[PDB]
Amino acid sequence: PGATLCLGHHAVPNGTIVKTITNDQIEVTNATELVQSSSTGEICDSPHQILDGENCTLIDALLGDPQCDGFQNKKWDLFVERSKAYSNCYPYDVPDYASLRSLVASSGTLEFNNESFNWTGVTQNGTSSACIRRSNNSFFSRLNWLTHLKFKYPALNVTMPNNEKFDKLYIWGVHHPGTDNDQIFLYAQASGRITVSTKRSQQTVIPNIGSRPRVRNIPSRISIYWTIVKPGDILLINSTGNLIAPRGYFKIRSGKSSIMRSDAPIGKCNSECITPNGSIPNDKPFQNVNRITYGACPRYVKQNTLKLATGMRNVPE
Amino acid sequence: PGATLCLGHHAVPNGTIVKTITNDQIEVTNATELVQSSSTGEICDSPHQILDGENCTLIDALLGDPQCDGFQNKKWDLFVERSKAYSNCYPYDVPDYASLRSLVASSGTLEFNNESFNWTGVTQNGTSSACIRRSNNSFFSRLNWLTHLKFKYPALNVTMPNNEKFDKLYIWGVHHPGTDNDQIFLYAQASGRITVSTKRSQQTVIPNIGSRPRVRNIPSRISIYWTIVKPGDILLINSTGNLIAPRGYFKIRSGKSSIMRSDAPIGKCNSECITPNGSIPNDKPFQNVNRITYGACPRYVKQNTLKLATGMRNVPE
Amino acid sequence: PGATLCLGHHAVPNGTIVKTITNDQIEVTNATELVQSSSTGEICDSPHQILDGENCTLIDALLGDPQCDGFQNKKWDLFVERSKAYSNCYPYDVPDYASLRSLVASSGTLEFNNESFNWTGVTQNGTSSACIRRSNNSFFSRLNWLTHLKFKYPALNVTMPNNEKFDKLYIWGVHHPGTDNDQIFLYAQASGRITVSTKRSQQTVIPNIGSRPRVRNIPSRISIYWTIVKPGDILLINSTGNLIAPRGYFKIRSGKSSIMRSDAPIGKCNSECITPNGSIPNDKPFQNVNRITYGACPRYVKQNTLKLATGMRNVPE
Amino acid sequence: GIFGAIAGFIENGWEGMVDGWYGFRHQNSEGIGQAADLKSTQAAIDQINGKLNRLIGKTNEKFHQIEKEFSEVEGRIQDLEKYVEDTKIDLWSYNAELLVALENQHTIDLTDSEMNKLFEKTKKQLRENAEDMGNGCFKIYHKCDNACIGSIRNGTYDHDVYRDEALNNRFQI
Amino acid sequence: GIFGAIAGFIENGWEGMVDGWYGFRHQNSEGIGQAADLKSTQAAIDQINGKLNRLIGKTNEKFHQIEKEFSEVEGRIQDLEKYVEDTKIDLWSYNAELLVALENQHTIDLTDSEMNKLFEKTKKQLRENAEDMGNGCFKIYHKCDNACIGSIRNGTYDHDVYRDEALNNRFQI
Amino acid sequence: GIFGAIAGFIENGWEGMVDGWYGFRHQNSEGIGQAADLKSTQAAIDQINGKLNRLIGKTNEKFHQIEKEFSEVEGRIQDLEKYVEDTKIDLWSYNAELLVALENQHTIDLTDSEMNKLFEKTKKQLRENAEDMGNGCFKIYHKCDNACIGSIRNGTYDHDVYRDEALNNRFQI
Ligand SMILES: *[C@@H]1O[C@H](CO)[C@@H](O[C@@H]2O[C@H](CO)[C@@H](O[C@@H]3O[C@H](CO[C@H]4O[C@H](CO)[C@@H](O)[C@H](O)[C@@H]4O)[C@@H](O)[C@H](O[C@H]4O[C@H](CO)[C@@H](O)[C@H](O)[C@@H]4O)[C@@H]3O)[C@H](O)[C@H]2NC(C)=O)[C@H](O)[C@H]1NC(C)=O
Ligand SMILES: *[C@@H]1O[C@H](CO)[C@@H](O[C@@H]2O[C@H](CO)[C@@H](O[C@@H]3O[C@H](CO[C@H]4O[C@H](CO)[C@@H](O)[C@H](O)[C@@H]4O)[C@@H](O)[C@H](O[C@H]4O[C@H](CO)[C@@H](O)[C@H](O)[C@@H]4O)[C@@H]3O)[C@H](O)[C@H]2NC(C)=O)[C@H](O)[C@H]1NC(C)=O
Ligand SMILES: *[C@@H]1O[C@H](CO)[C@@H](O[C@@H]2O[C@H](CO)[C@@H](O[C@@H]3O[C@H](CO[C@H]4O[C@H](CO)[C@@H](O)[C@H](O)[C@@H]4O)[C@@H](O)[C@H](O[C@H]4O[C@H](CO)[C@@H](O)[C@H](O)[C@@H]4O)[C@@H]3O)[C@H](O)[C@H]2NC(C)=O)[C@H](O)[C@H]1NC(C)=O
Ligand SMILES: *[C@@H]1O[C@H](CO)[C@@H](O[C@@H]2O[C@H](CO)[C@@H](O[C@@H]3O[C@H](CO)[C@@H](O)[C@H](O)[C@@H]3O)[C@H](O)[C@H]2NC(C)=O)[C@H](O)[C@H]1NC(C)=O
Ligand SMILES: *[C@@H]1O[C@H](CO)[C@@H](O[C@@H]2O[C@H](CO)[C@@H](O[C@@H]3O[C@H](CO)[C@@H](O)[C@H](O)[C@@H]3O)[C@H](O)[C@H]2NC(C)=O)[C@H](O)[C@H]1NC(C)=O
Ligand SMILES: *[C@@H]1O[C@H](CO)[C@@H](O[C@@H]2O[C@H](CO)[C@@H](O[C@@H]3O[C@H](CO)[C@@H](O)[C@H](O)[C@@H]3O)[C@H](O)[C@H]2NC(C)=O)[C@H](O)[C@H]1NC(C)=O
Ligand SMILES: *[C@@H]1O[C@H](CO)[C@@H](O[C@@H]2O[C@H](CO)[C@@H](O)[C@H](O)[C@H]2NC(C)=O)[C@H](O)[C@H]1NC(C)=O
Ligand SMILES: *[C@@H]1O[C@H](CO)[C@@H](O[C@@H]2O[C@H](CO)[C@@H](O)[C@H](O)[C@H]2NC(C)=O)[C@H](O)[C@H]1NC(C)=O
Ligand SMILES: *[C@@H]1O[C@H](CO)[C@@H](O[C@@H]2O[C@H](CO)[C@@H](O)[C@H](O)[C@H]2NC(C)=O)[C@H](O)[C@H]1NC(C)=O
Ligand SMILES: *[C@@H]1O[C@H](CO)[C@@H](O)[C@H](O)[C@H]1NC(C)=O
Ligand SMILES: *[C@@H]1O[C@H](CO)[C@@H](O)[C@H](O)[C@H]1NC(C)=O
Ligand SMILES: *[C@@H]1O[C@H](CO)[C@@H](O)[C@H](O)[C@H]1NC(C)=O
Ligand SMILES: *[C@@H]1O[C@H](CO)[C@@H](O)[C@H](O)[C@H]1NC(C)=O
Ligand SMILES: *[C@@H]1O[C@H](CO)[C@@H](O)[C@H](O)[C@H]1NC(C)=O
Ligand SMILES: *[C@@H]1O[C@H](CO)[C@@H](O)[C@H](O)[C@H]1NC(C)=O
Ligand SMILES: *[C@@H]1O[C@H](CO)[C@@H](O)[C@H](O)[C@H]1NC(C)=O
Ligand SMILES: *[C@@H]1O[C@H](CO)[C@@H](O)[C@H](O)[C@H]1NC(C)=O
Ligand SMILES: *[C@@H]1O[C@H](CO)[C@@H](O)[C@H](O)[C@H]1NC(C)=O
Ligand SMILES: *[C@@H]1O[C@H](CO)[C@@H](O)[C@H](O)[C@H]1NC(C)=O
Ligand SMILES: *[C@@H]1O[C@H](CO)[C@@H](O)[C@H](O)[C@H]1NC(C)=O
Ligand SMILES: *[C@@H]1O[C@H](CO)[C@@H](O)[C@H](O)[C@H]1NC(C)=O
Ligand SMILES: *[C@@H]1O[C@H](CO)[C@@H](O)[C@H](O)[C@H]1NC(C)=O
């Protein structure tokens, strides 16, 4: 009689299809998903310091638009800009807006030390009806609108040395008045010229009087510029009018910080990876949620699923 | 006596050499080429809408150089620029020529709606002997050369609102006269200043009188600029002379369109992939014909051949 | 009795750990390192023509700062800039410094032909106490500081045609005086305007009088610009003052040349691959020494070791 | 599939083997039984976990990068920003597609190998006391009760004990 | 080569087998013959076509990109445009070189595997009626006419029918 | 490991075999000996050198590139320069990690294959004159002096010479 001894392997009733080198569809006993394709919809507030911009662009908070006063001296790992945000101070533009945005975002701080600039000969703290702070007329909190003292605007030549261990980032601007009358009213001469300089750099700007289409009923404009002053170097503002001067400087750091456009609500939760659609788990090596990511994230790929076999070929009865 | 039963495999007299992980030269029974390395020499006119530039750069057709009048309002998947092409109107330059070229190319249309600009106070439709249209003196078809009316050039302040659902692309320019005399002759004052503006942007340009080396015997120059005006925004041209004004706007779309430099003839044929050397088949996954491609194309690699084995190792008798 | 015949394989007492697809730690009999992770510390002077900048940036040698006179007409495969280097002539800046640096570096030559420019009406060869050459006051060797002749500076309009087979690269500049007095002293009129032009291009520059913080006790500045003039084209300098004119042109080539920042000493040795830390051997396919390389180099990767098994699995007794 | 066991000479898997990946079925005088082989099962599982270790939970930190969506037409610099990101994504997508396809081919083959190794080890153990039926089963030419079958599964089977009995049954007319 | 059949224990291929990739040659009482095995042949061919499906006709559409040739020196922005494209091309070139070399190693090995599997299946079928000569051939120890050889090629050979005859011829002095 | 020989049915390697990678140990009437097999050894070594040829000394020349370190904050264009290089380095780092892991898996498997092939070739050679003990060793059922063992190592062993003697010893009670 004897006996029979058979060698075999298992199989399952619920197989999954995977791709191989030789065959785009072969059934295996089990598999695991390698592409993360969903989010909860929320930006988790840990473990990164999230700063919700709310109504303010980063730039508006930098300048000191009055609805952004809560943002003074704050820090962030990720600054989140909302699409509903809007400016509500003096209408402005920034040549190379994206570069200023990027470098502030990347520095990750709005820390501002004031400095005593020698503005003898002019009227400081100019205000306007387009930049309201508690029903009064006001201005950009970190800028200083200089006008004439007794219908006289003497030639300015103000120095500010960097004797510190770190870089100073100076934000300043140029008023472009709406009419020739306004140019005389505010500065008591025909359009000036500004020249901000250091030992390594110089930026000269020409004010240009004229009407632009009204933004919040204001046809004048301010053009914002910036200057980085290194240790042992000196800031030098030369002007004969139209200067929107700095009240001080921003510290500029390096670090992990950045900025992201998103409309996701901020949650009380912990998640290393952030996208504009919400935080995503980072167990998987790939994701197709968003090409824009921050933190320890799976790498973005075009595929929406990639099945890795974690079992043998399934061969049913 | 019994019998003999031998197991074997085939072989061929004409083997091919392939590369492997362990050996750069092993003979297999058969192989297929994975690098496409040839073209017929022709750009196939299907399935992409090809527009042969012939004598005209895209920019010349945009502006309305007189040999490019056939190109008015045309569309393209791929615009093809020829190396023999040349300009034959008023000598010009474009700061950031490449960016204007790119964005028009990518929009894929030259569709132009005219608009009734309020040019009361000046003489429109200025002409020149360097821009010939049917033996008469003429100008760029889409631009408007404004000169004095009765030796007077009043200050211009013309508005054009975008009340449409789409962006408008405005092309305009600044005349730089050859001499001080010509500046008075054409505009009745010393060199002006132009200021084209919107709610989000402003471009001011200074005309600069002086001689440049003659191009087609003309030492003056026009500098071309552009402006995109969004829905609910308004164009505003401020000027005291030297304005080469727009007659209207170009629609700007997004899509599949682009531009390619090539001297290949256009064929009556069907081919998904286009290079500057001609169309190429796209059966293979790689090609070494050109790094510049358009359509569904094999990916460019440095190798000129890559043999994939499609048979077993060849082991002759 | 019979016999016993055993089949086996070798093993070693000193195994090495390698990574595999299925196991991050498996012992093999032998392995070879694929990441080059060290240098001797020296830049080998062969087989590439190394030019040690020493005290001079490439730009200083281009302009002709007086400590850089040894560099006139020299060639290089790799120009090496030292961090100790400093300028000691007239304080200057270059808008787009990086682009001029890059294109000279890449051309790989400083070959300079002088040209006889028609400067009748002015005083050539202006000097200064901030640019010392053998205790005398001097200037940038390749530039020409034009001042008034008999308190008169006539309008300049000087032509220089490129009748050659190759491009000419012209380097020129604009003096920005410290005070209004100095502007009259040197040029006998109020601030001029320069306009360098060709058939395809024009660069107009506005001088801007004013004080900048002193660099080597000098508050004035020169701003350096450049112009490439093609075969059959013509250079044209228009000016009413403030021109720092060229004495001639640089040949511009294409080739293998470049530039590297390093403080490594130059050795008498042969090595195809150069990094800022010194030359490295190129037997291995990868390196983690520096992402900046020149020559036939291993590719930079983040890993500091990668062990390739060159033997079987080690299975000790 | 490259070894020829799973989806080859083993006609199909066993859905009723739920305690291991590989195993033994027998018929003898005491009935018909089944048991898992732990060592084979663990060998395949360890190797698959080795792959998973390299792929699960090994992500990389990025912080400030470049802009990848744009509200305005700009031309040159934006073309280059878009192109770089599109380039990056295609190469990573290629890497992910190739990884999965190679790993999957290799997982299918290593699982087949583990089956083949268990069959070969068992065949050697049985020496001249059994013949291979060609479908993963051995005809054992001697009385082999549950303790005997047990001794084969456990690697303790002494083939000399049954050799006389088996040779005789094997080479009979 | 990794299984040891093609370019191993099978000394060479047969140029005169033009109707399949793998097959049988025999010598018996009725003469000397040849026949292809379709199943082995198709198994290898299907797998190679599987690779071809992934590589042939699977290209990607690109439209507006960046400029990759330049008529003027420009410096910074052009360096970066050139660098990005040079970077892209080297990584794709690397991908293509590695793909071909891995696929080729694997094709050579799968074809060798298919040969080894056909040899192993045949060896089991013959049970104790034949011995392996070490060069891909079996010495069959019984009269085996064309229908018998046919039955081995077709998987219908009944080994019990010839077992007596074969054992006797095998273990004779 | 995929063939089951090295770190499988061969329990361990031999540290005292220093003249080859693979080899033979014997016990017979004249004593206990060892010898390397050159052909197996060379087959594995050639294949590993084939890999080394593709990896050692095959570097690529680059000259002027882009700047990769910066002394000033600049914003947009520098972000894009940094990003491109960071992108390039991660993809090359990925390529190097994957290469080493695949090549290593394959080297371990080809070395195991070479061992298995030498065992299989030897098993066939011995025909009915020996049985496999399951640990890489054959019990040879006849007097086999040093010249006989030599003839097996050299591929010249004539199995018909000892067949009578071996069959008798094999199937005795
Ligand atoms: C099909 O194939 C897959 C992959 O091979 C198998 O899934 C794995 O199964 C194991 C065991 O069931 C799981 O191990 C558990 O991991 C938990 C962590 O899960 C979270 O975090 C990981 C990433 O770190 C994510 O992958 C995952 O999605 C979750 O978000 C642990 O918390 C578990 O711990 C429990 O058991 C241990 C015992 O040691 C205790 O100490 C704990 O207290 C706790 O009770 C556990 O270790 C593993 O997560 C699964 N991996 C994946 C990728 O999904 C399937 O099992 C298999 N299917 C079948 C039918 O075989
Ligand atoms: C060596 O190895 C290669 C690859 O394995 C083999 O070449 C293949 O062979 C098959 C059969 O001969 C070919 O199949 C045919 O494809 C035609 C399409 O060809 C064009 O388009 C493809 C891409 O879509 C390109 O690859 C190709 O270059 C051509 O531009 C079909 O039109 C054919 O159809 C014919 O037969 C069918 C029968 O089903 C009918 O329905 C049709 O009416 C028609 O008569 C056919 O399907 C295949 O193209 C080849 N591939 C490649 C990549 O070249 C060799 O056969 C092999 N050599 C040897 C000696 O074995
Ligand atoms: C562990 O694994 C590694 C790799 O498999 C083995 O190392 C190799 O061993 C061989 C032989 O010992 C070496 O071959 C020799 O190469 C020399 C060149 O070396 C330099 O250049 C190469 C790149 O071109 C670099 O890889 C290397 O680091 C050196 O900078 C030759 O000069 C040698 O020539 C000598 O012998 C020949 C005989 O033909 C004579 O003609 C010459 O006159 C001269 O005497 C020789 O060819 C090889 O370099 C090693 N490769 C690597 C990558 O290191 C180990 O052998 C192995 N270990 C063990 C214990 O087995
Ligand atoms: C150049 O032309 C533009 C466009 O006409 C001039 O701007 C326009 O100026 C008027 C007022 O001077 C604005 O009228 C407004 O009407 C609303 C009614 O709802 C009223 O609430 C406001 O108080 C205001 O009076 C008009 O909107 C405005 N348009 C734009 C687009 O700015 C411009 O003033 C002219 N330039 C010069 C230098 O005069
Ligand atoms: C600055 O100098 C340049 C170069 O000398 C002046 O341009 C030159 O002007 C003359 C005419 O005024 C051009 O002469 C031409 O000669 C041809 C003969 O073939 C004739 O057909 C033309 O009608 C013309 O008279 C000369 O080519 C031209 N050269 C260049 C390079 O433009 C320029 O006018 C001077 N600037 C000022 C403001 O005067
Ligand atoms: C705008 O204000 C700046 C800063 O006060 C003025 O520059 C300064 O000018 C004085 C001389 O006029 C420099 O004094 C120096 O003192 C040293 C003593 O060690 C002496 O060796 C020098 O000969 C020199 O007299 C001072 O350093 C300098 N500071 C800077 C930062 O440049 C500038 O002149 C004013 N602008 C105008 C148009 O006056
Ligand atoms: C994450 O958010 C992005 C938003 O950018 C989604 O991608 C867009 O989806 C819309 C509509 O589904 C498409 O028309 C666009 O083509 C996408 N935009 C871009 C810029 O690619 C994405 O679908 C979201 N993903 C998840 C998982 O929620
Ligand atoms: C396709 O056209 C291009 C034209 O750019 C050819 O590439 C050039 O070939 C010339 C001469 O053979 C070389 O000197 C250049 O180095 C190449 N230029 C560039 C920019 O790479 C290419 O040979 C053509 N290919 C085919 C298959 O026709
Ligand atoms: C080669 O030189 C570079 C100098 O850039 C070294 O990399 C820097 O090392 C310092 C200190 O070890 C770190 O703080 C920096 O993060 C590195 N700088 C950059 C820009 O990455 C590198 O260590 C040197 N390598 C060798 C092998 O000598
Ligand atoms: C099969 O069914 C079980 C039990 O319901 C489930 O947990 C498992 O994940 C399923 N496996 C697959 C591969 O679908
Ligand atoms: C943000 O602005 C909206 C109106 O634009 C207002 O409803 C909301 O209360 C504001 N919130 C804050 C915190 O300013
Ligand atoms: C700079 O300031 C000085 C001193 O007040 C003055 O003489 C000069 O005119 C100013 N220049 C400009 C351009 O504002
Ligand atoms: C070999 O010859 C045939 C018949 O002429 C041909 O069609 C086939 O493509 C050739 N194969 C190779 C691999 O060269
Ligand atoms: C293009 O211009 C050339 C001369 O430059 C001329 O021969 C040809 O006829 C022109 N064709 C068209 C369509 O303008
Ligand atoms: C703009 O137009 C207005 C109204 O005609 C005029 O007062 C002003 O001078 C113009 N400005 C410029 C710069 O052209
Ligand atoms: C082992 O030892 C030898 C002899 O000292 C040495 O040359 C060899 O490189 C070592 N091998 C490994 C893998 O460590
Ligand atoms: C370089 O300058 C330093 C001082 O800055 C000096 O010690 C050295 O001698 C100089 N060498 C040359 C060649 O100019
Ligand atoms: C200017 O300088 C050069 C070089 O020192 C000299 O040879 C030349 O004669 C000078 N030219 C004039 C006009 O003074
Ligand atoms: C250019 O030179 C000419 C001729 O000397 C002169 O009439 C004109 O004013 C100059 N223009 C400038 C901007 O220097
Ligand atoms: C085999 O081993 C298992 C250990 O789990 C034990 O239950 C069984 O009794 C053993 N049988 C024999 C016959 O060795
Ligand atoms: C084997 O099968 C083929 C079917 O094509 C048939 O021609 C042949 O007669 C069969 N022979 C036997 C003996 O089964
Ligand atoms: C086996 O071959 C070697 C050749 O190196 C020789 O030394 C030995 O005597 C041979 N022995 C036999 C029995 O063939």
Numbering used by the authors:
A (entry chain A), B (entry chain A), C (entry chain A): 9 to 325
D (entry chain B), E (entry chain B), F (entry chain B): 1 to 173
Mind quoting what the paper says about this structure?
Our results reveal that the L194P substitution substantially increases the flexibility of an epitope region that is commonly targeted by antibodies.
To minimize any possible experimental bias, we obtained another X-ray structure for Bris07 L194 that was crystallized in the same precipitant condition as Bris07 P194 and diffracted to a similar resolution (2.35 Å) to that of Bris07 P194. While the overall average B-value of Cα atoms in Bris07 P194 (58 Å2) was slightly lower than that of Bris07 L194 (64 Å2), the 190-helix (residues 188 to 197) in Bris07 P194 was notably higher (142 Å2) than that of Bris07 L194 (109 Å2). This difference could be visualized by comparing the electron density in the 2Fo-Fc maps, which was much weaker for the 190 helix of Bris07 P194 compared to that of Bris07 L194. Except for a slight displacement (less than 1.0 Å) of the 190-helix and the 130-loop, the backbone conformations of Bris07 P194 and L194 are almost identical. The Kd of C05 IgG for Bris07 L194 was around 3 nM, but for Bris07 P194 was much weaker at >5 μM, as measured by a biolayer interferometry binding assay.
